[PDB]
UniProtKB/Swiss-Prot annotation, chain A:
The lineage of its organism: Viruses, Duplodnaviria, Heunggongvirae, Peploviricota, Herviviricetes. Homomultimer. Makes the hexons and eleven out of twelve pentons. Interacts with triplex proteins 1/TRX1 and 2/TRX2; adjacent capsomers are linked together in groups of three by triplexes, heterotrimeric complexes composed of one molecule of TRX1 and two molecules of TRX2. Interacts with scaffold protein; this interaction allows efficient MCP transport to the host nucleus. Interacts with capsid vertex component 2/CVC2. Interacts with the small capsomere-interacting protein/SCP. It comes from the Viruses. Belongs to the herpesviridae major capsid protein family. This is Major capsid protein. Self-assembles to form an icosahedral capsid with a T=16 symmetry, about 200 nm in diameter, and consisting of 150 hexons and 12 pentons (total of 162 capsomers). Hexons form the edges and faces of the capsid and are each composed of six MCP molecules. In contrast, one penton is found at each of the 12 vertices. Eleven of the pentons are MCP pentamers, while the last vertex is occupied by the portal complex. It comes from Epstein-Barr virus (strain B95-8) (HHV-4). It is found in: Virion; Host nucleus.
Curated annotation (Swiss-Prot), chain B:
Signal peptide: none annotated. The chain holds residues 362 to 395 of 1381 of the full protein. Belongs to the herpesviridae major capsid protein family. This is Major capsid protein. It comes from the Viruses. Self-assembles to form an icosahedral capsid with a T=16 symmetry, about 200 nm in diameter, and consisting of 150 hexons and 12 pentons (total of 162 capsomers). Hexons form the edges and faces of the capsid and are each composed of six MCP molecules. In contrast, one penton is found at each of the 12 vertices. Eleven of the pentons are MCP pentamers, while the last vertex is occupied by the portal complex. It is found in: Virion; Host nucleus. Disulfide bonds: none annotated. Homomultimer. Makes the hexons and eleven out of twelve pentons. Interacts with triplex proteins 1/TRX1 and 2/TRX2; adjacent capsomers are linked together in groups of three by triplexes, heterotrimeric complexes composed of one molecule of TRX1 and two molecules of TRX2. Interacts with scaffold protein; this interaction allows efficient MCP transport to the host nucleus. Interacts with capsid vertex component 2/CVC2. Interacts with the small capsomere-interacting protein/SCP.
Length: 36, 34, 91, 91
């Protein structure tokens, strides 16, 4: 009984415009990692 | 024969001990190079 | 080392031994100044080099006093190396 | 491991086991050269790998001498691994 399946939610944004410090690269996609 | 205790620093390196000592004091009293 | 003796001796293993001479010369030599040079783990480092130095040459007539352990060898150091061994090997 | 056995065996858990084979092969294998390679914590590292190696296979007839502890297993190492275990596991 002490092997409970912990389940919670991850979240991540794709394609955000970073505002300028006063930006020619624009993200179309975002990368993540597997469990492998 | 009776066994006398002689002085030696004994470190235990794993399963068998060894008796580390130095004779630099024996060579310095006679002013001899070690 | 038994690992390079148990294969007998070939002409291929001789190059491994001549390279292992240099690899043991550059790293393990002057081990006490390296143990003062490095960070933590100096006690295991000094105890490791001394234990390999015992294992290189591998009733009892010379026992310890408060036990019965045969004393199985003797290190002969200088007076400057004796205390730097006795501090890294505290007990 | 009881954690992947207590769920029975499915076809989904087989991919987890085949990936866990590689994850245990790349990290935990040749643990003694890694324990010499790393910084501090080598005693807990070696004791951890040996304790997992005992727990993998999990009156008494073989007790210790000055106590009564049953000796519950036996490691058979080489002569080069015996002293590198006995230095990292000092007591």
């Amino acid at each position: 009984p002490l092997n409970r399946r912990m389940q919670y939610s991850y979240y991540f944004p794709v394609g955000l415009f970073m505002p300028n410090p006063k930006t020619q690269q624009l993200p179309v996609e975002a990368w993540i990692v597997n469990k492998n | 024969q009776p066994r006398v205790p002689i002085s030696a620093a004994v470190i235990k390196l794993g399963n068998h001990a060894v008796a580390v000592e130095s004779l630099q004091k024996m060579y310095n009293d006679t002013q001899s190079p070690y | 080392d038994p690992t390079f003796t148990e294969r007998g001796f070939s002409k291929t293993v001789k190059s491994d031994l001549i390279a292992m001479f240099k690899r043991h010369l550059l790293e393990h030599s002057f081990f006490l100044d390296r143990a003062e040079n490095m960070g933590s783990g100096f006690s295991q480092y000094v105890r490791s080099r001394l234990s390999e130095m015992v294992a290189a040459v591998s009733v009892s007539t010379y026992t310890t006093a408060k036990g019965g352990e045969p004393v199985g060898g003797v290190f002969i150091v200088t007076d400057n190396v004796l205390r730097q061994l006795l501090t890294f090997l505290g007990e």
